[PDB]
Design a protein around this ligand. Structure first.
Ligand code: ADP
Ligand code: ADP
Ligand code: ADP
Ligand code: MG
Ligand code: MG
Ligand code: MG
Lengths: 505, 505, 505
């Protein structure tokens, strides 16, 4: 391999790479702007050791005393239905509300799994609110305590706009202790000094400072039955999410997945890339027709098309190739269907007729031939009707309107096309036509599908294959040439079709 | 690869390398001369340990006491609108001013984000000043305190020229402590001694000394409720920016990016570099025409041009190549447009006519032919009009004024050029002309674009391709030769055009 | 590569290597003999630890007390205008003078940058002196103190010749302390003992001993409110500059830069080195003419020259090469101008005429031909006048005086040389001359520049190229041979010219 090839492949697939990288970067930006910020508060205490004090601070007694003091077993969560509602509310500048609950007691269903009872509180005004646990609706008022339906609740100082909802959960004490212990860290920072740094992370910058102050005070009171140097304060810059590293990771991930996909697609290509691939085997490529981005003939609708220019190049190439041929019959065929045989043949006939030579076009695709549709037709009396014997040699020839050449349609689809094409009346037709016309072009089905082309090619002076640019492979074209030679038909060469411009070439 | 090639490439691209390196060095010099200088002050104290004292010095209690003492929570910044205004003011020798503020209290909006209120003070004279916070204009006087609009301010000892502006911010205490702690360092320097080195970096050489003295005094007073050996002094040589290393890094970065760009451009070149590239394939290069830096013929305006000398070399080469040819018709063609076919053909006709031989020039570029413009014209009755049949063989031939040879213009642009060129009247014209002239030169469109050149080349005794120096590639020229041979036209050889002098060759 | 080639290259470039190495060694010797000597004084004290004492000795309190005691803040420098004046004065045996200043107080301008005020003192005699600070001239006398113009000065014991000048600077205290601390070192030398070695380097062998004694005494007095074993003494042998290592480094640096330059020049050579380089391609080198270090013909002025001997060798080689040639016309040409075509042709004609054969010399360089100047001329009626038709075949032939052969000059420079040379009168001239002379030699312009040589070579029986020894390359000669063959001219071979003797061959 070489650098030029890889750079060309990257240039060709630029749209895919850009789209994938942009999608990944957009997802990264959305996550980094919608993820909830996490603040960190710190405190510094002095040990008058410090190896067992790390375990004493994280023991369930200290944390449990803190949780009992601060009522951390009442989980209040602002209610947003979607997974991005909270982030959108924060971005729009909306101020989150809060409720001070000093007493909560749910009926404690305590089944096998749901060990955490929860209710939903809807704020109707600054004073009253509605409560629903499992569809049971109740009404409560700030101030006076509520003892109804096995539910006890005391709510103070609602701070939210009316219509807001809050999920109130009474999680078990061990769950609260585990949650507190997950986000709480103790370090020595000197490995020998009495200095201990206590760290607590959480999404509420004031609550975490209060929690760490309570932890420190409880530990201090417990020890004297240690010195608090730095009481806990919260860093106003969140520690998570780290937006810049997230976005950089997203961009690099997009680039690497795009490069992997591009390499995978490149290594899985088998189609023909250039005429030199065919010419390595020993197949003369007589032309390369580009894609015409422009039920009518292109050589007639848009005579100045680039594809028609390539076809004129093919015409002047054939005027020299088709010399010293046994007759004036040219047979266009191919390996696979929808390669361009009818396009090539019809347009070539048009470009050769505009130069003043009489041209006959025969649609010998007795199976899926649509030439009569493209030329303007009387569908009666095609090639089939002549071959089966129910027509004459003069009632099957029609004239293309915007063309300048005659044509013979397929006719009705027969049940035995390959056996009709073997009748000697076909050779009689070709011998008769080879005296009233200057050129005869025959369109045929593929050869890798059926065998009609190989029957027709016996009476053809020149035979050319059509290879589609990306679809067919060199193996298919070689197999087709060999199958034609096995049946006694000499293929003059190939015609690459549907070519497009690639920066890797 | 070899050393000579890389040295030649470096010599050829010297201008690009010099420009890029100079731009990078200029940017580095601008940064190193405009970046604000940062001074460093040091102190040395003695510990009568020293592992917890590093944490005690950087604790928020000591720094907070220092900040409360020195009022470091009032941030005063000189106002320069651009990002280089301060550096320019320092370079021009301007003395920065300062204000001693002993009391500031802003209304403390304290919204979600802007936790730091700020005002702008404009100095009108040595005594009075103007204040604007959010468009609210107020006037104040040094001395008497200001208590207006929820704003309290006491300003003493303004030292600046009138018209200067100062941004006064009241940043939060924790922000001030964090900023102080970011630029403050403590080290032991012996890992066992009681000697501690305290270091403080800042842009004001006196303020940092005062701050470090206050830090040391506060720590000393706290401990006795330690010895100060070296009170803080400031090194007058700034520690940042380090100009020499910055400039060296800039120069080396410029050199490496220039070398990378040069290597990238060299590895992405595909055009023809020397006639030997064409002669490897087996194409006889008959000449190499240099660029003529000098609507007129070069072989006439400047007969002593270097390009005309190369064309005379081509003329004497052709006088030997064109022997034993079937007729006296020469066809100049090419692979891509704007390669030099009309330049080469017209100048060659001029140089062959100055030697006393009758020369006919034909502009068979029926699509974009401008020869009549270059020769002085009566645009009627060109090649088109003759081919279509509406003109005679004698009404199309005109004479070049400063030339010495006849010519035939294209005429009106036809709708079917390639089909006009196939008429036998073209061959009749060439056969008639081959008896009244000594040489016939035909200019043609490219062959990779259209097929006109391949129609004309049937009646041409000699055919030569023109390859542009850097534009065309060996692949294009090989494809063109093969496409000409496929149509029965033997190409004698090639003509390299637009050559320039490269030190890598 | 092989050892013989590199040894030969080194022998060939011996002069360059010797010159570069001698220049580098001279610069090294000048630096090592003009750099100011730096003495080192040492002391040894005993610590009754020693880790904090290193920091206590280098603290600003001890050094500041020393500087206040010894007045190290008054910098007195002997005035020499050049950067080598002090070294020259020391080498000539001149004794430096000194002044004891016990009180200095400058006005202390104290601007942004110049924090060190300074004055210049000129010694008029043993008693009085002149002072200038910024053009303000004052006169002072030893003894009585000076208090004038904001300048206070007390000068004692001037020791210098009259007319000497001294720069007196009052540098800031911190600058003096930093300078003292830069050259002062403390070491333990045992890592555990109480022994401390104090080291001080400076250019005054007595002052540094006094300074180190003061440092030790101040530290000793401070500690007792330690034992001084070895009071400071100065090593009379300077520690810097180390002359021998400096000179060795200079010599080795010169050798390596010379070798690098030689290798770079060798790898950048492209010219022809030996006739075998041409004979590899398949070009017969018929001679190799050496440089003639000796407006006249060499074969006439100095017939026994070595170059004329090589030309006689070429003559006897040609007498065999030029057999079976179609006529007796020899054409000397070349690739690039100033290769030796006229030298070779004229001298060859002289050496062939001295053997009794009639020789005609033609100067067909119609552009820059100076043969008539070298032969003695009547500049009228040259080749140009004959070709244009305004002269006869007998009025253009002249006789060389000290030669023995006839010649034809170019004549007036024409506007169309290449088109004059194509006239059939040139062939008529050559055919007429080929019957009255035994040999005809034609001198021509280069072929890589113009095409005249290729026009003339059609009528030349033998054609030889001239390649200059170092200038031309094998590529140029191959291109020239190919361009001659493209135009139908067979080049018999080459002639290497301007050869010199190289030890690498
Ligand atoms: N170079 C081309 N540019 C534009 N359209 C093309 C080109 N080649 C084929 N086609 C069109 O795509 C369709 C498939 O080609 P077609 O020749 O009809 O199939 P088949 O090869 O099986 O006979 C057709 O409608 C044809 O007009
Ligand atoms: N060696 C050259 N030196 C100077 N100008 C040139 C040279 N070769 C081509 N040109 C000029 O650049 C333009 C493009 O060349 P041209 O021959 O006219 O295009 P084309 O090859 O398509 O016929 C022209 O204006 C031509 O005069
Ligand atoms: N081997 C040589 N020894 C001494 N002088 C030489 C030698 N070769 C050429 N020259 C002199 O150097 C100059 C350049 O050579 P010359 O033959 O005149 O140029 P050109 O090859 O273009 O005709 C001349 O003055 C010539 O006399
Ligand atoms: Mg079909
Ligand atoms: Mg053109
Ligand atoms: Mg000369």
């Amino acid at each position: 391999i070489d650098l030029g090839r890889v750079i060309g492949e990257l240039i060709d697939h630029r749209k895919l790479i850009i789209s994938i990288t942009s999608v990944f970067t957009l997802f990264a930006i959305l996550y980094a702007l919608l993820a909830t910020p996490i603040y960190e508060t710190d405190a510094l205490i002095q040990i008058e050791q410090s190896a067992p004090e790390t375990a004493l601070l994280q023991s369930r007694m200290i944390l449990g005393k803190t949780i009992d003091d601060l009522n951390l077993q009442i989980q209040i969560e602002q209610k947003y239905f979607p997974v991005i509602g909270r982030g959108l509310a924060r971005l729009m500048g909306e101020k989150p509300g809060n409720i001070d609950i000093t007493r909560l007691y749910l009926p404690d269903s305590d089944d096998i799994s749901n060990n955490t009872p929860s209710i939903i509180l809807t704020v109707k005004d600054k004073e009253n609110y509605s409560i629903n646990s499992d569809g049971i609706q109740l009404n409560g008022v700030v101030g006076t305590l509520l003892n109804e339906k096995g539910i006890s609740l005391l709510v103070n100082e609602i701070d939210a706009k009316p219509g807001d909802q809050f999920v109130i959960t009474q999680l078990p004490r061990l769950k609260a202790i585990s949650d507190l212990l997950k986000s709480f860290s103790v370090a020595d920072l000197g490995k020998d000094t009495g200095m201990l740094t206590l760290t607590l992370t959480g999404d509420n910058p004031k609550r975490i400072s209060h929690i760490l102050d309570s932890i420190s005070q409880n530990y201090l009171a417990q020890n004297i039955a240690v010195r608090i140097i730095d009481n806990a304060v919260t860093d106003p810059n969140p520690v998570r999410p780290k937006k810049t590293i997230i976005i950089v990771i997203g961009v690099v991930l997009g680039l690497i997945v795009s490069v992997v996909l591009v390499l995978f697609q490149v290594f899985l290509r088998r189609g023909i890339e250039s005429p030199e691939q065919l010419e390595e085997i020993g197949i003369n490529v007589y032309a390369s027709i580009p894609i015409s981005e422009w039920d009518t003939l292109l050589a007639v609708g848009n005579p100045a098309d680039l594809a028609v220019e390539a076809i004129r190049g093919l015409r002047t190439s054939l005027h020299f190739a088709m010399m010293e041929a046994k007759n004036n019959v040219l047979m266009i065929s191919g390996a696979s269907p929808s390669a361009g045989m009818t396009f090539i043949s019809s347009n070539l006939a048009a470009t050769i007729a505009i130069t003043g030579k009489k041209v006959l076009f025969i649609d010998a695709d007795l199976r899926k031939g649509y030439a009569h549709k493209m030329f303007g037709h009387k569908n009666d009396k095609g090639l089939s009707e002549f071959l089966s014997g129910q027509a004459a040699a003069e009632m099957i020839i029609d004239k293309v309107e915007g063309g300048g050449f005659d044509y013979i349609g397929r006719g009705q689809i027969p049940p035995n096309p390959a056996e009709l094409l073997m009748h000697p009346r076909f050779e009689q037709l070709l011998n008769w036509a080879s005296q009233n016309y200057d050129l005869i072009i025959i369109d045929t089905p593929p050869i890798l599908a059926v065998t009609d082309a190989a029957i027709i090619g016996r009476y053809a002076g020149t035979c050319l294959l059509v290879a589609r640019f990306e679809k067919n492979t060199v193996k298919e074209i070689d197999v087709s040439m060999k199958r034609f030679e096995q049946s006694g038909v000499v293929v003059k060469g190939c015609i690459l079709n549907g070519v497009v411009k690639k920066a890797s070439s």
